[PDB]
Structure 1
């Protein structure tokens, strides 16, 4: 039986999602799996989206400062994980930052920075500790979420792609696929090994933080690993000479000022990589290193504004510089 390579890509969840698969299974089986991948991505846009009126998350937010709302097991589990990372990161990653994000989101659409007072007011409504998750223990008991703080709003944008990537990996596995590369707007999951009959690690590129992105600065070889990168270039606007990027510091309510240009997190679960990449950007290098010691099975790669690159022990030997302006410190 012969190995075939397949790819499919669509615009969905606000970005380009592409899955590449190598498989010796009948083509019709791979096609079936890919059909389901992209159906899942469509259905989940309608669960998780913070910027759509129809979604289950928007309906949940419409009940801030009221009674508990029943949610499916999957959303509950995602929120649990998000609150865990909010606690561990000291609020650097915060899934209850919707009131602030919403102000900045109109800012982007308008090319305008939000009013100082409006932001300070929004920051009174971002206490993730007031998100109460409860699940009864009895057979078939429902899962519920209560937003106890008035006008608090969830925004799962900084963890949602990792959640979906992990869900897609579970689906691929359920379809007896064990070799794939999932790319959801740049959040990568490398499932298994690729083919050359020889089996090889997937080679994932990391962009120059200040480059068009067309070519990678560095490449890392990985198996069964997510690679998620946070940088100021993912989304920003400019007004009066200043760039305002999308990664908000929850202490200031403004885009984070940090000592790294990008951080890339390598983890067994993309959900974890996504949350950590966001926290780490906000935290900066030294505080990140401290946080990451609490997650032994995770690795990281930092690109500094002076083009120095530092990578943790788990992956440093798997990093290759492609753009010689960058230096890998060992």
Structure 2
């Protein structure tokens, strides 16, 4: 088969799109110009790094009056609220002020650790309860609420590009943005698209079929000294970077937006409560956990068939 590869910058990372050419398909340059327009739009709606994005303008809004947003932004926020419910508070897109405090957002930070008083002041302006939606509108009940969609708008971008390839008659694709992946159909060799799971480096290749895959963390954090764990993933209950022994969480779901949110959420819950949610909701999840004698893999019932 003829496999076409498109690549470009978005969201402070890169995209890689592979697809199998077919008779009557639009040319690669037409498709790429539209892919770049759609991804610029995801950035102009939902990038916290763009001061004039819809999301940043909501973040700068001080009043509790409903703030009108695009249907795309509303869809992503609506899914973040549903995932907050599913992960019992662990996925909370209102931790923006803590993400920024700890040095993982657009805010310029020193290498000095926040004081207890600085940390408690940011914790006070976080909580999913401050955020409500109504039609294509968002509302904040405290002026300083800062919503961060970094954990989910990446998967959303993958879904937008995958829907656009489907809309152009392309049934055989891999869409990847910053390691968030969506697959359909068959690769160059007429086999199901191949993905590697990295283990403490050791690589197992799986075939998810028609599915999205998201991973939080990677294998390398396993080799780091003991000490306060370095992480851009915040535990909303402590206001601090997570400090559990979960190395990586991989999730499969038909939506890449959903996989991306779940992988981060279940990682925050930790393996005992995270694997119970995965079992209760038939989520395909693979967790790598660090132990004293090495690492453990926990595969959910619905992940095991891919191994």
Q: Please, what TM-score do these two structures have when normalized by structure 1?
A: 0.84
Moved more, 124-133 or 112-121: 112-121
Q: Provide the C-alpha distance between the structure 1 equivalents of 2:199 and 2:279, rounded to a whole number of angstroms.
A: 26
2:117 match: 117
Give the conservation status (yes or no) of the 8 Å contact 1:225–1:267: yes
| Alignment CA distance shift 1:28-1:144 (3 Å) | closer
More RCO (CA 8 Å, sep 6+): 2
Shift of 1:150: 3.1
1:127 match: 127
The match for 2:155 among 162, 178, 201 is: 162
Superposed CA deviations along residues 208-251 of structure 1, whole A, max 9, x for unmatched, are 46x5xxxx62222111111111116799xx9x964421111111
Q: What 5-or-longer segments of structure 1 have no aligned partner?
A: 136-142, 320-330
In the alignment, structure 1 residue 312 sits paired with structure 2 residue 300: yes
| Structure (1/2) with the larger strand percentage | 1
Q: Provide the C-alpha distance between the structure 1 equivalents of 2:257 and 2:151, rounded to a whole number of angstroms.
A: 9
In the alignment, structure 1 residue 175 sits paired with structure 2 residue 168: yes
What is the CA RMSD across the aligned residues, in angstroms? 2.4
| Alignment CA distance shift 1:263-1:195 (3 Å) | same
Shift of 1:115: 2.2
In the alignment, structure 1 residue 286 sits paired with structure 2 residue 279: no
Q: Provide the C-alpha distance between the structure 1 equivalents of 2:245 and 2:229, rounded to a whole number of angstroms.
A: 16
Shift of 1:127: 1.4
Shift of 1:72: 1.0
1:52 match: 50
Give the conservation status (yes or no) of the 8 Å contact 2:92–2:128: yes
The match for 1:248 among 234, 240, 245 is: 234
Q: Secondary structure at the match of 2:35?
A: helix
1:140 match: none
Q: Provide the C-alpha distance between the structure 2 equivalents of 1:80 and 1:126, rounded to a whole number of angstroms.
A: 17
Q: Provide the C-alpha distance between the structure 1 equivalents of 2:57 and 2:38, rounded to a whole number of angstroms.
A: 20
Q: Provide the C-alpha distance between the structure 2 equivalents of 1:81 and 1:234, rounded to a whole number of angstroms.
A: 30
The match for 2:183 among 176, 184, 190 is: 190
Give the conservation status (yes or no) of the 8 Å contact 1:10–1:18: yes
Q: Secondary structure at the match of 2:182?
A: strand
For 1:67-146, list aligned pairs within 5 A: 67-105=65-103, 110-135=110-135, 143-146=136-139
1:11 match: 9
The match for 1:152 among 110, 127, 145 is: 145
In the alignment, structure 1 residue 204 sits paired with structure 2 residue 195: yes
| Alignment CA distance shift 1:108-1:299 (3 Å) | farther
Shift of 1:68: 1.2
Q: Please, what TM-score do these two structures have when normalized by structure 2?
A: 0.90
Q: Provide the C-alpha distance between the structure 2 equivalents of 1:313 and 1:201, rounded to a whole number of angstroms.
A: 21
Give the conservation status (yes or no) of the 8 Å contact 1:10–1:17: yes
Q: Secondary structure at the match of 2:134?
A: strand
Give the ranges of 4+ consecutive aligned residues of structure 1 lying more than 4 Å apart after TM superposition.
106-109, 232-235, 240-243
Q: Secondary structure at the match of 1:279?
A: helix
The match for 1:272 among 250, 254, 258 is: 258
Shift of 1:185: 0.5
